[PDB]
């Protein structure tokens, strides 16, 4: 039974750190989309050129 | 679909990059178009002479 409540406890705990992981992750992608759009009208611009 | 909306941009600023064009050889043709009249008021006035 210890044991039990051993890997329990562990296994709630690594849980929240793919939450972490998730949340960092997602702010990643979100700055990213920034830049493909600002490079996006940058080929629009060099097209323009 | 980020790849065809790089193209659709560019695509369309060529589209308006060809309409220049036009313009411009509009406006040679139009100045080509005076000088043939003074020629031939020219070639009137040669035969005359």
Redesign the interface.
């Known amino acids: 039974a210890n044991r039990f409540t051993a890997n329990i406890k562990g296994l709630t705990q690594a849980s929240r750190n793919a939450n972490d992981g998730i949340s960092i992750a997602q702010t990643t992608e979100g700055a990213l989309n920034e830049i493909?759009n600002n490079l996006?009208?940058v080929?629009?611009l060099a097209?323009?050129s």
Chains 1, 2 share one sequence.
Do not use: A, L, T
Request: proline letters at 0%; a positive charge.
């Open positions: 493909n996006q009208r080929r629009e097209v323009q």
